[PDB]
Amino acid sequence: MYRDLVLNPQNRSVNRGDDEISLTKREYDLLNILMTNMNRVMTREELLSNVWKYDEAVETNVVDVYIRYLRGKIDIPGKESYIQTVRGMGYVIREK
Resolution of the determined structure in angstroms stands at 1.5
Ordered structural domains, the chain, with CATH: 1-96 (1.10.10.10)
Q: What is the SS3 assignment for the chain?
A: CCCCCEEECCCCEEEECCEEEECCHHHHHHHHHHHHCCCCCECHHHHHHHHCCCCCCCCCHHHHHHHHHHHHHHCCCCCCCCCEEECCCEEECCCC
Q: Which residues pair with 8 in a beta bridge?
A: 13
d(CA 55, CA 57): 7
Of residues 93, 85, 83, 91, the one with CA closest to residue 45: 91
d(CA 80, CA 61): 23
d(CA 48, CA 63): 6
Experimental method: X-ray
